[PDB]
Design a protein around this ligand. Structure first.
Ligand SMILES: Cc1noc(C)c1-c1ccc2c(c1)O[C@H](CC1CC1)C(=O)N2
Length: 126
C-alpha cells in the first residue's frame, strides 16, 4: 500500500480562475498530449503498487501526471498558466529522474515533451 494520496485537484481556499491561457492549455496543449499514442502511462498517477515499484514514492516526492493536470484545468484549480506549465515540467522531470535513459517510459516522455514545448511556444495572450 505504498501509493500516496494523489495530488489535490481542488482546494477550498486556493483561489480559482479561468484565463485565455488556461483555456489554451486545456483545449490545445493537454488535448494534443492526451490523445497521443504515448500519453497513457501519464494519464493517471504512477501506481507503485501495480507496477511493483515500491521505491517510486521514496524517490519522487512531488508526483504529477496528466490526469491530475486535466482535472485541475477542468476544476479551475489554477490561478495562472505558469502553475500548469510547472505541473507538466514536474511530470517530465520526475520521469527522467526515476527512470534510466533508453527505458521505454523515458522515450515516451521525450516525445510528449517535444510536443508540449511546440504547443507552449504558441501560448496566446500575445
Ligand atoms: C509515467 C511513469 N514514470 O515512471 C514510471 C515507472 C512510469 C510509469 C507509469 C505507468 C506505467 C509504466 C511506467 O510502465 C508501463 C508502461 C511503460 C513501459 C512503457 C505500464 O504499463 N504503466
Amino acid at each position: 500500500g505504498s501509493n500516496p494520496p494523489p495530488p489535490e485537484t481542488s482546494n477550498p481556499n486556493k483561489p480559482k480562475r479561468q484565463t485565455n491561457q488556461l483555456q489554451y492549455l486545456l483545449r490545445v496543449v493537454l488535448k494534443t498530449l492526451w490523445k497521443h499514442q504515448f500519453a497513457w502511462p501519464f494519464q493517471q498517477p504512477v501506481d507503485a503498487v501495480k507496477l511493483n515499484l515500491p521505491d517510486y514514492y521514496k524517490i519522487i516526492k512531488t508526483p504529477m501526471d496528466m490526469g491530475t493536470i486535466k482535472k485541475r484545468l477542468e476544476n479551475n484549480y489554477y490561478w495562472n498558466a505558469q502553475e500548469c506549465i510547472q505541473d507538466f515540467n514536474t511530470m517530465f522531470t520526475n520521469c527522467y529522474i526515476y527512470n534510466k535513459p533508453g527505458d521505454d517510459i523515458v522515450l515516451m516522455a521525450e516525445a510528449l515533451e517535444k510536443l508540449f514545448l511546440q504547443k507552449i511556444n504558441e501560448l496566446p495572450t500575445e
